[PDB]
Every structure is written in structure tokens, then in C-alpha cells.
Amino acid sequence: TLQCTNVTNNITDDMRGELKNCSFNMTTELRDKKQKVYSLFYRLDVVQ
Amino acid sequence: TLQCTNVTNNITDDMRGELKNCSFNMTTELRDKKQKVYSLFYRLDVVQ
Amino acid sequence: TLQCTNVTNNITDDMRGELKNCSFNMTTELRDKKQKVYSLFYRLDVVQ
């Protein structure tokens, strides 16, 4: 699962809500460790 | 990740540090269990 | 690992112990979530 926020600032106003910023509690390549990362996503690729 | 020590057994002194004894809690035949096991390794196969 | 009980509901007595009801902590399709699950099983396919 991802935690997210609406992307804000530096946008055309007709782009509002089209992008979300989200993050992961996903593991490192070592199986015993964890890292936090985040990425830009189109709203179309996610569902609450 | 594995814990290790520089285990010896009447090692010649030009072999020191070439082998390490290390251990981890592995995986088991059932997803719900773990166990600790150790084995010898050549120094070449590991990095701190 | 499975938690289990003998199924005694609605059963002819020469069938006793042929079925067990059991349950487990196996994962949901989300990587970070789990769900309780249970099913009937034939005694032949399980061991203590």
C-alpha cells in the first residue's frame, strides 16, 4: 500500500489532481532491510 | 545479513582471516518459522 | 502453520476425524496485509 498526497505547486490549474505523490515502505534488495522511497504517479494508475 | 567471526581450527598463520564462520535466521519449511544456522565461507564471497 | 479442530457437526460416526477445520495467518494480495483464512481438509493431507 501507498501513502499519498496531491501534487501541488508549479502546475497549470487544469492539471489539478492529475498527479499524486506517494511512498513505499518497500524492502531493500537485502531481504532483511527496509527503505522508504517515493514516486510521481498519474491518478489513473491508482485507486484508493 | 550474516553475523560473522574469524573462526579457526589449528589454522596456519598464512591462512588467517581467509575463512569466516557466519550465521543467519534463514527460512524454514513453514513460512511461520525461522531458525539459526551457520557455515564456513571464503572471505572472497562476502563483504562487510 | 495451521490451527485446527475435529469436525463433529452433522457427521456419521464412522467418519469421525476424517475432516478437520483449520485456519491460518496467510497474506492478502497486498504485500503488507494478512487475513484469517480457514478451510475443511481431509485428514490424509495433513500431519501434526
Epitope: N25, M26, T27, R31, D32, K34 | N25, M26, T27, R31, K34 | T27, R31, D32, K34
Partner: antibody, heavy 140, light 112 residues
């Protein structure tokens, strides 16, 4: 009722360390949390620190950081605590008590090809029965 | 995380119900729904004894006069029919977050 034993009361000079010990009959420390508590007459209880019944965790109330340690005899039949830097305002009744905890996974990721990533933690549930305690005071 | 308790002390008329409260900066509830709250009584001249625990039950061998309440940041301890042997001080405790802590406590004393 497990018997509990603690060190006799002691007077110590200001600016210096003291040490205490405790015991549980039947080597029941293996099944209980080690705890230390401090109290002053006319004042509320203060947790000092603990050790897990597995012995794989220890800790201190933050007031004691860098002044306290906890050790035990092999096979955990007894436990010890050392206090450092004591001054006259450290006069208190000290206690050793047994305890209980709840260990619950706090986070997980299932892995198809390996052990599940897991996070765990301890929540104290109850204090178990209190030791008779020790008294420690500090004077010239 | 911090803990407080009130009233600092309570005068008591014998044979009458009375209660104590404990509050803290964060809920004592856990994601499992577990609560890590416990109350203790210290008679003077004696070590403390568990009264209730995990915000849900009396400790074994505790009189049934004992009860408690609440959720989240607020909890109470109540004793119906308070008796002179309930004199002493009381402490709420948090096992939910490190370092484990006690409330500042309250004192029960018979009114005079």
C-alpha cells in the same frame, strides 16, 4: 510465589556509583521481565529500567541514560544493576520487580522467496510481584 | 509521551464509592485494539500491588469493589464502598510506549 531477593541498603559518598543485585527463585527470570523502580518518600513511583525475559532487550527511563547498566548471572538466576554518579538527591528506595509483556508484530511484508520482512515490539502488560527492595542513600 | 493523574489526593467518606483518573498525551490503545494501562496501589510501608490491568480487568485476587473506565487518552479507576484499607497511593502505568512510565499518582485518605 517466586522468592525475590535484593541487596541490603547502603550509604554512599556523593558523586559516585552504587551497585545492586537481585534474585528470583527457581530461575524464573527466564519467564519474567526484569525491572528496576525508584521511589522517594512522599513521591510517586519512577520506572528505572528493564530487561526482557528473553534477555534480548534492555532499557532505561531517559533520566538515567549514561548512568545505569543491567547485567545478569549466566542462566539468568540473578540480575544486577549499577547506578553511577549518585548524589544526595538520589536517596531513594530502589526496587527489583518481576514483570510481563506482550510481544506483537508491528509490521510485516510477506516474502514469496524468503522470510517475511518483520518488525516487532514489546508492550509492558503488568508488573509482577515486587521485590522487598533496597534502600540507597548518599551522604558525606 | 506524558502522563498525569487527578485529584492529587482525595479525602474519603468510608463506605462510599470514589474514583481516580489518569490522562496522557496519546492513546493507550494499540493497533490490535489492546490497551496498555494498569493501576497499582501502594499501602504505606509496603510495595505497590496491581489493581487492574490492560484497562480491562481486575488483577486476580482484587476485591470486586474495583472497576475502571475510558478509552484513548482518558482512563479512570473506581472503587465502590471505599474502606480505610484502601488508603495509600495509586499509580496508573503505561506499557504502550518506551520508556515505560507511571502517572504522578494520587493519594486516597479518609476524610477528617
Amino acid at each position: 510465589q517466586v522468592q525475590l531477593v535484593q541487596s541490603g541498603a547502603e550509604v554512599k559518598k556523593p558523586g559516585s556509583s552504587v551497585k545492586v543485585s537481585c534474585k528470583a527463585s527457581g530461575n524464573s527470570f527466564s519467564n519474567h521481565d526484569v525491572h528496576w523502580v525508584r521511589q522517594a518518600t512522599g513521591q510517586g513511583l519512577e520506572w528505572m529500567g528493564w530487561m526482557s525475559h528473553e534477555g534480548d532487550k534492555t532499557g532505561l527511563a531517559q533520566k538515567f541514560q549514561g548512568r545505569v547498566t543491567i547485567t545478569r548471572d549466566s542462566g539468568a538466576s540473578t540480575v544486577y544493576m549499577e547506578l553511577r554518579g549518585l548524589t544526595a538527591d538520589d536517596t531513594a528506595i530502589y526496587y527489583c520487580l518481576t514483570g510481563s509483556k506482550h510481544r506483537l508484530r508491528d509490521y510485516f511484508l510477506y516474502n514469496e522467496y524468503g522470510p517475511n520482512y518483520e518488525e516487532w515490539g514489546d508492550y509492558l502488560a503488568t508488573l509482577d510481584v515486587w521485590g522487598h527492595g533496597t534502600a540507597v542513600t548518599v551522604s558525606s | 509521551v506524558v502522563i498525569t493523574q487527578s485529584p492529587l489526593f482525595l479525602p474519603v467518606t468510608p463506605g462510599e464509592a470514589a474514583s481516580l483518573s489518569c490522562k496522557c498525551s496519546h492513546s493507550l490503545q494499540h493497533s490490535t485494539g489492546a490497551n496498555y494501562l494498569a493501576w497499582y496501589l501502594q499501602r504505606p510501608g509496603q510495595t505497590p500491588r496491581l489493581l487492574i490491568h490492560l484497562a480491562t480487568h481486575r488483577a486476580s485476587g482484587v476485591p470486586d469493589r474495583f472497576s475502571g473506565s475510558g478509552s484513548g487518552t482518558d482512563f479512570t479507576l473506581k472503587i465502590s464502598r471505599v474502606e480505610s484499607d484502601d488508603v495509600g497511593t495509586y499509580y496508573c502505568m503505561q506499557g504502550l510506549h518506551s520508556p515505560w512510565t507511571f502517572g504522578q499518582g494520587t493519594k486516597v485518605e479518609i476524610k477528617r
